[PDB]
Amino acid sequence: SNIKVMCRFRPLNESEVNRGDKYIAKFQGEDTVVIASKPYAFDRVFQSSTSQEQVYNDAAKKIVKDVLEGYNGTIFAYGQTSSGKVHTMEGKLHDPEGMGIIPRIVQDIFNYIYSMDENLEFHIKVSYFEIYLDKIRDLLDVSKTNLSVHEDKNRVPYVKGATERFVSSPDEVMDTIDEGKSNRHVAVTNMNEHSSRSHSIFLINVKQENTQTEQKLSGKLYLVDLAGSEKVLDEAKNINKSLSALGNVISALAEGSTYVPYRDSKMTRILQDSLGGNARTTIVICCSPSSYNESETKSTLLFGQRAKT
């Protein structure tokens, strides 16, 4: 199994401080967090004061290199609502300090590409879509609202009709993310409720061709901001279904099973060529350190434990 799991704790938020919550996360070394005297070991644990830069460097940087070598990959943000998933995945998009994983990935991709000599030709294209109530919508074309999953020649599942946009700079990709977030408001009355109950999926497809040696390489990287994992409606059941499917896929891979139940959900089907097999995966579980959220945090930590070999 190629899955790594890293746990990120955010600082206590304003409500938590005012309410008088206790900081219940205890840290041991760089890989362990202990809750109520019970330890949970991961590939890495980030404490509340961990910077965006360091999170990227541990969770994502190496996967970006693999994608530039022709690997596929997935990076997930998992955790209850307000645990810091979007701050981690997106952060402040145009801010060199505040930017999250996706902007740093894109920068790294282009930094490598523009440094290469004339023998290499690159084509970078991005897609951005969401899954809500078990329906796929293109965030770059809001007329595309119930996209189906299809399989190509080589039995590779794909989203039929999803917008694929060619990009040639990090600024252009950020502009694409900005447009997607704005488009996401279409037909949505409450964004907080919607975003907490849907999964957002950003895809970067990096194709390269050395015209001198006549070699081609292609790498796909999916960046997934999952629905909130909290136990707190048709929305709930759909969300339970999609995360439980991902859970079973992760456990199957962690067991070294040859059979992996990708078909358990649309999402895992979509990610089939970039999750398991020879693809690289990091799950970043996000948690509140507040005593008030102790039950959901334990649940999040136990979800992360699934990837343990």
GROMACS .gro file of C-alpha atoms in nm:
model
  309
    1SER     CA    1   0.000   0.000   0.000
    2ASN     CA    2   0.121   0.346  -0.104
    3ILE     CA    3  -0.113   0.537   0.132
    4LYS     CA    4   0.028   0.785   0.388
    5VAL     CA    5  -0.185   0.949   0.653
    6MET     CA    6  -0.099   1.276   0.818
    7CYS     CA    7  -0.297   1.437   1.093
    8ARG     CA    8  -0.331   1.816   1.114
    9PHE     CA    9  -0.454   1.995   1.425
   10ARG     CA   10  -0.574   2.354   1.379
   11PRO     CA   11  -0.556   2.614   1.654
   12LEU     CA   12  -0.852   2.651   1.891
   13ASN     CA   13  -1.102   2.886   1.721
   14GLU     CA   14  -1.277   3.192   1.864
   15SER     CA   15  -1.590   3.008   1.976
   16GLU     CA   16  -1.383   2.737   2.144
   17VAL     CA   17  -1.166   2.985   2.335
   18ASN     CA   18  -1.467   3.192   2.447
   19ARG     CA   19  -1.662   2.881   2.550
   20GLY     CA   20  -1.372   2.777   2.772
   21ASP     CA   21  -1.271   2.456   2.591
   22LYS     CA   22  -0.963   2.260   2.695
   23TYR     CA   23  -0.680   2.165   2.457
   24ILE     CA   24  -0.701   1.785   2.470
   25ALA     CA   25  -0.450   1.682   2.206
   26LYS     CA   26  -0.119   1.564   2.352
   27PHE     CA   27   0.174   1.517   2.118
   28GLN     CA   28   0.452   1.260   2.115
   29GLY     CA   29   0.746   1.279   1.877
   30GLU     CA   30   0.650   1.375   1.521
   31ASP     CA   31   0.405   1.092   1.447
   32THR     CA   32   0.177   1.044   1.745
   33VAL     CA   33  -0.116   1.221   1.903
   34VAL     CA   34  -0.262   1.097   2.230
   35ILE     CA   35  -0.623   1.156   2.327
   36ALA     CA   36  -0.750   1.058   2.672
   37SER     CA   37  -0.427   0.860   2.733
   38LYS     CA   38  -0.487   0.665   2.408
   39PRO     CA   39  -0.219   0.701   2.132
   40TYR     CA   40  -0.282   0.722   1.757
   41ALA     CA   41   0.022   0.682   1.529
   42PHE     CA   42   0.036   0.819   1.174
   43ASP     CA   43   0.305   0.897   0.917
   44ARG     CA   44   0.309   1.251   1.055
   45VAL     CA   45   0.120   1.468   1.304
   46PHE     CA   46   0.107   1.844   1.258
   47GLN     CA   47   0.053   2.051   1.570
   48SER     CA   48  -0.163   2.363   1.587
   49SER     CA   49   0.122   2.600   1.501
   50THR     CA   50   0.238   2.405   1.191
   51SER     CA   51   0.278   2.630   0.884
   52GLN     CA   52   0.120   2.582   0.544
   53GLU     CA   53   0.468   2.536   0.396
   54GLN     CA   54   0.566   2.246   0.623
   55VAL     CA   55   0.232   2.070   0.571
   56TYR     CA   56   0.288   2.081   0.196
   57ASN     CA   57   0.650   1.966   0.218
   58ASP     CA   58   0.554   1.652   0.414
   59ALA     CA   59   0.214   1.566   0.270
   60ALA     CA   60   0.238   1.664  -0.096
   61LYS     CA   61   0.579   1.769  -0.231
   62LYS     CA   62   0.700   1.418  -0.307
   63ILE     CA   63   0.371   1.319  -0.474
   64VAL     CA   64   0.415   1.618  -0.707
   65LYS     CA   65   0.756   1.482  -0.807
   66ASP     CA   66   0.599   1.138  -0.872
   67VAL     CA   67   0.335   1.294  -1.097
   68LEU     CA   68   0.616   1.466  -1.289
   69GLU     CA   69   0.767   1.118  -1.331
   70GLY     CA   70   0.445   0.973  -1.475
   71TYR     CA   71   0.268   0.849  -1.159
   72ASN     CA   72  -0.094   0.914  -1.070
   73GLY     CA   73  -0.192   1.035  -0.726
   74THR     CA   74  -0.461   1.147  -0.483
   75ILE     CA   75  -0.452   1.383  -0.185
   76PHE     CA   76  -0.758   1.395   0.043
   77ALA     CA   77  -0.863   1.632   0.320
   78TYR     CA   78  -1.081   1.443   0.569
   79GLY     CA   79  -1.241   1.564   0.895
   80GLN     CA   80  -1.544   1.722   1.056
   81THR     CA   81  -1.676   2.058   0.932
   82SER     CA   82  -1.464   2.357   1.054
   83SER     CA   83  -1.165   2.129   1.122
   84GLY     CA   84  -0.958   2.316   0.863
   85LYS     CA   85  -0.990   2.109   0.546
   86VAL     CA   86  -1.025   2.400   0.303
   87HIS     CA   87  -0.763   2.605   0.490
   88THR     CA   88  -0.531   2.307   0.438
   89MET     CA   89  -0.620   2.228   0.075
   90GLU     CA   90  -0.669   2.583  -0.058
   91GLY     CA   91  -0.580   2.828   0.214
   92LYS     CA   92  -0.529   3.183   0.093
   93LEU     CA   93  -0.480   3.114  -0.279
   94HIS     CA   94  -0.271   3.416  -0.386
   95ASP     CA   95  -0.089   3.459  -0.053
   96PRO     CA   96   0.267   3.320  -0.049
   97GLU     CA   97   0.244   3.248   0.328
   98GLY     CA   98  -0.123   3.161   0.360
   99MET     CA   99  -0.163   2.946   0.047
  100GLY     CA  100  -0.249   2.580   0.103
  101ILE     CA  101  -0.159   2.254  -0.069
  102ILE     CA  102  -0.319   2.303  -0.411
  103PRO     CA  103  -0.151   2.637  -0.488
  104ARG     CA  104   0.192   2.506  -0.377
  105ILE     CA  105   0.150   2.196  -0.596
  106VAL     CA  106   0.071   2.404  -0.901
  107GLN     CA  107   0.371   2.629  -0.835
  108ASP     CA  108   0.598   2.325  -0.811
  109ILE     CA  109   0.462   2.175  -1.128
  110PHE     CA  110   0.530   2.489  -1.331
  111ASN     CA  111   0.863   2.562  -1.163
  112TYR     CA  112   0.986   2.225  -1.290
  113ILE     CA  113   0.833   2.256  -1.638
  114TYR     CA  114   0.967   2.605  -1.723
  115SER     CA  115   1.315   2.495  -1.617
  116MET     CA  116   1.326   2.214  -1.875
  117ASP     CA  117   1.499   2.260  -2.210
  118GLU     CA  118   1.336   2.274  -2.555
  119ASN     CA  119   1.323   1.894  -2.597
  120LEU     CA  120   1.020   1.867  -2.368
  121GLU     CA  121   0.670   1.975  -2.462
  122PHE     CA  122   0.410   1.997  -2.186
  123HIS     CA  123   0.032   2.010  -2.180
  124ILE     CA  124  -0.136   2.084  -1.847
  125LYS     CA  125  -0.512   2.065  -1.811
  126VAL     CA  126  -0.739   2.101  -1.510
  127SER     CA  127  -1.092   1.999  -1.417
  128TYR     CA  128  -1.297   2.104  -1.115
  129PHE     CA  129  -1.618   1.936  -1.010
  130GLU     CA  130  -1.821   1.844  -0.705
  131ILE     CA  131  -2.027   1.554  -0.577
  132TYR     CA  132  -2.342   1.641  -0.383
  133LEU     CA  133  -2.634   1.406  -0.311
  134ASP     CA  134  -2.467   1.172  -0.509
  135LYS     CA  135  -2.466   1.390  -0.828
  136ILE     CA  136  -2.164   1.520  -1.014
  137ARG     CA  137  -2.163   1.887  -1.117
  138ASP     CA  138  -1.893   2.064  -1.322
  139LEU     CA  139  -1.783   2.375  -1.128
  140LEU     CA  140  -1.649   2.531  -1.450
  141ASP     CA  141  -1.975   2.488  -1.650
  142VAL     CA  142  -2.287   2.506  -1.435
  143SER     CA  143  -2.512   2.372  -1.712
  144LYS     CA  144  -2.339   2.034  -1.653
  145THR     CA  145  -2.528   1.912  -1.345
  146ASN     CA  146  -2.566   1.533  -1.336
  147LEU     CA  147  -2.261   1.397  -1.506
  148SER     CA  148  -2.226   1.024  -1.545
  149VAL     CA  149  -1.917   0.811  -1.493
  150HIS     CA  150  -1.801   0.616  -1.798
  151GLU     CA  151  -1.516   0.375  -1.872
  152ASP     CA  152  -1.277   0.420  -2.167
  153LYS     CA  153  -1.100   0.161  -2.387
  154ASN     CA  154  -0.866   0.050  -2.110
  155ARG     CA  155  -1.149   0.025  -1.854
  156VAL     CA  156  -1.050   0.361  -1.703
  157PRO     CA  157  -1.347   0.535  -1.540
  158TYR     CA  158  -1.394   0.905  -1.632
  159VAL     CA  159  -1.654   1.182  -1.591
  160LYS     CA  160  -1.831   1.229  -1.920
  161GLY     CA  161  -1.860   1.591  -2.029
  162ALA     CA  162  -1.650   1.742  -1.748
  163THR     CA  163  -1.473   2.066  -1.848
  164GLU     CA  164  -1.101   2.027  -1.915
  165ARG     CA  165  -0.915   2.358  -1.925
  166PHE     CA  166  -0.556   2.403  -2.052
  167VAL     CA  167  -0.340   2.618  -1.825
  168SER     CA  168   0.009   2.758  -1.862
  169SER     CA  169   0.068   2.939  -1.531
  170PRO     CA  170  -0.005   2.910  -1.159
  171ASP     CA  171  -0.202   3.237  -1.172
  172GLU     CA  172  -0.425   3.090  -1.443
  173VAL     CA  173  -0.496   2.781  -1.230
  174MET     CA  174  -0.582   2.995  -0.928
  175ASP     CA  175  -0.816   3.192  -1.154
  176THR     CA  176  -0.976   2.860  -1.248
  177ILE     CA  177  -1.019   2.769  -0.882
  178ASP     CA  178  -1.164   3.116  -0.813
  179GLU     CA  179  -1.415   3.075  -1.092
  180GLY     CA  180  -1.513   2.727  -0.965
  181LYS     CA  181  -1.579   2.853  -0.613
  182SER     CA  182  -1.792   3.138  -0.746
  183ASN     CA  183  -1.982   2.901  -0.983
  184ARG     CA  184  -2.045   2.663  -0.696
  185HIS     CA  185  -2.288   2.923  -0.551
  186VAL     CA  186  -2.518   2.875  -0.849
  187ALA     CA  187  -2.847   2.719  -0.736
  188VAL     CA  188  -2.720   2.703  -0.377
  189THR     CA  189  -2.903   2.901  -0.105
  190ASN     CA  190  -2.675   2.807   0.187
  191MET     CA  191  -2.312   2.756   0.094
  192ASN     CA  192  -2.199   2.655   0.443
  193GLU     CA  193  -2.449   2.372   0.446
  194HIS     CA  194  -2.375   2.282   0.081
  195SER     CA  195  -1.997   2.286   0.104
  196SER     CA  196  -2.001   2.086   0.427
  197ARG     CA  197  -2.222   1.823   0.261
  198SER     CA  198  -2.044   1.786  -0.074
  199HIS     CA  199  -1.706   1.671  -0.202
  200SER     CA  200  -1.495   1.903  -0.420
  201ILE     CA  201  -1.244   1.746  -0.660
  202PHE     CA  202  -0.968   1.935  -0.841
  203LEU     CA  203  -0.775   1.743  -1.109
  204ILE     CA  204  -0.441   1.837  -1.266
  205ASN     CA  205  -0.336   1.631  -1.566
  206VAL     CA  206   0.030   1.679  -1.656
  207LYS     CA  207   0.135   1.547  -1.998
  208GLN     CA  208   0.495   1.561  -2.124
  209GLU     CA  209   0.666   1.456  -2.442
  210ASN     CA  210   1.037   1.445  -2.514
  211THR     CA  211   1.049   1.507  -2.889
  212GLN     CA  212   1.417   1.406  -2.903
  213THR     CA  213   1.394   1.065  -2.735
  214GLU     CA  214   1.031   1.024  -2.848
  215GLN     CA  215   0.914   0.934  -2.494
  216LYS     CA  216   0.578   1.044  -2.347
  217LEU     CA  217   0.476   1.064  -1.983
  218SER     CA  218   0.146   1.148  -1.819
  219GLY     CA  219   0.046   1.196  -1.457
  220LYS     CA  220  -0.290   1.267  -1.298
  221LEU     CA  221  -0.328   1.432  -0.959
  222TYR     CA  222  -0.665   1.452  -0.783
  223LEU     CA  223  -0.704   1.691  -0.491
  224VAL     CA  224  -1.016   1.611  -0.291
  225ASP     CA  225  -1.187   1.820  -0.025
  226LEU     CA  226  -1.431   1.572   0.129
  227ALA     CA  227  -1.769   1.639   0.291
  228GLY     CA  228  -1.763   1.681   0.669
  229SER     CA  229  -1.727   1.352   0.851
  230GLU     CA  230  -1.942   1.450   1.152
  231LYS     CA  231  -2.244   1.243   1.255
  232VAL     CA  232  -2.451   1.563   1.254
  233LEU     CA  233  -3.192   1.450   0.530
  234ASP     CA  234  -3.091   1.277   0.208
  235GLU     CA  235  -2.757   1.458   0.237
  236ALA     CA  236  -2.647   1.260   0.543
  237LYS     CA  237  -2.704   0.916   0.388
  238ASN     CA  238  -2.522   1.008   0.067
  239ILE     CA  239  -2.229   1.140   0.269
  240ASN     CA  240  -2.220   0.829   0.489
  241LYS     CA  241  -2.219   0.617   0.170
  242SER     CA  242  -1.938   0.801  -0.008
  243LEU     CA  243  -1.701   0.818   0.295
  244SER     CA  244  -1.773   0.458   0.396
  245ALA     CA  245  -1.686   0.353   0.039
  246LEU     CA  246  -1.355   0.537   0.062
  247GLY     CA  247  -1.304   0.377   0.400
  248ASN     CA  248  -1.351   0.029   0.254
  249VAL     CA  249  -1.117   0.108  -0.037
  250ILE     CA  250  -0.849   0.226   0.205
  251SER     CA  251  -0.887  -0.075   0.437
  252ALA     CA  252  -0.879  -0.313   0.142
  253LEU     CA  253  -0.552  -0.159   0.020
  254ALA     CA  254  -0.409  -0.155   0.375
  255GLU     CA  255  -0.480  -0.530   0.400
  256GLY     CA  256  -0.292  -0.589   0.076
  257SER     CA  257  -0.610  -0.722  -0.087
  258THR     CA  258  -0.597  -0.775  -0.460
  259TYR     CA  259  -0.970  -0.693  -0.484
  260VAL     CA  260  -1.053  -0.330  -0.401
  261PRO     CA  261  -1.419  -0.221  -0.391
  262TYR     CA  262  -1.394   0.097  -0.607
  263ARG     CA  263  -1.746   0.032  -0.738
  264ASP     CA  264  -1.887   0.106  -0.387
  265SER     CA  265  -1.925   0.478  -0.493
  266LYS     CA  266  -1.895   0.725  -0.783
  267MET     CA  267  -1.603   0.897  -0.619
  268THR     CA  268  -1.392   0.585  -0.572
  269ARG     CA  269  -1.475   0.482  -0.927
  270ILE     CA  270  -1.358   0.822  -1.054
  271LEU     CA  271  -1.037   0.795  -0.855
  272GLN     CA  272  -0.980   0.430  -0.954
  273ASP     CA  273  -0.667   0.497  -1.163
  274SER     CA  274  -0.520   0.736  -0.902
  275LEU     CA  275  -0.594   0.549  -0.578
  276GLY     CA  276  -0.435   0.212  -0.507
  277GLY     CA  277  -0.232   0.010  -0.755
  278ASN     CA  278   0.088   0.202  -0.824
  279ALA     CA  279  -0.063   0.543  -0.746
  280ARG     CA  280   0.050   0.752  -0.448
  281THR     CA  281  -0.193   0.873  -0.184
  282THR     CA  282  -0.183   1.103   0.114
  283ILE     CA  283  -0.483   1.145   0.337
  284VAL     CA  284  -0.469   1.452   0.552
  285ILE     CA  285  -0.706   1.410   0.841
  286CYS     CA  286  -0.793   1.747   0.998
  287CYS     CA  287  -0.893   1.784   1.363
  288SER     CA  288  -0.998   2.035   1.626
  289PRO     CA  289  -0.794   2.003   1.948
  290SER     CA  290  -1.099   2.111   2.156
  291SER     CA  291  -1.249   1.901   2.437
  292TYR     CA  292  -1.584   1.995   2.290
  293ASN     CA  293  -1.509   1.795   1.973
  294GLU     CA  294  -1.345   1.492   2.139
  295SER     CA  295  -1.591   1.229   2.000
  296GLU     CA  296  -1.567   1.345   1.636
  297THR     CA  297  -1.189   1.380   1.660
  298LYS     CA  298  -1.160   1.019   1.783
  299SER     CA  299  -1.379   0.914   1.489
  300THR     CA  300  -1.154   1.107   1.251
  301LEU     CA  301  -0.841   0.954   1.400
  302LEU     CA  302  -0.994   0.605   1.372
  303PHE     CA  303  -1.076   0.671   1.004
  304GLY     CA  304  -0.709   0.761   0.950
  305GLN     CA  305  -0.600   0.436   1.121
  306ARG     CA  306  -0.759   0.239   0.836
  307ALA     CA  307  -0.455   0.297   0.613
  308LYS     CA  308  -0.225   0.127   0.866
  309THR     CA  309  -0.066  -0.177   0.696
   0.00000   0.00000   0.00000
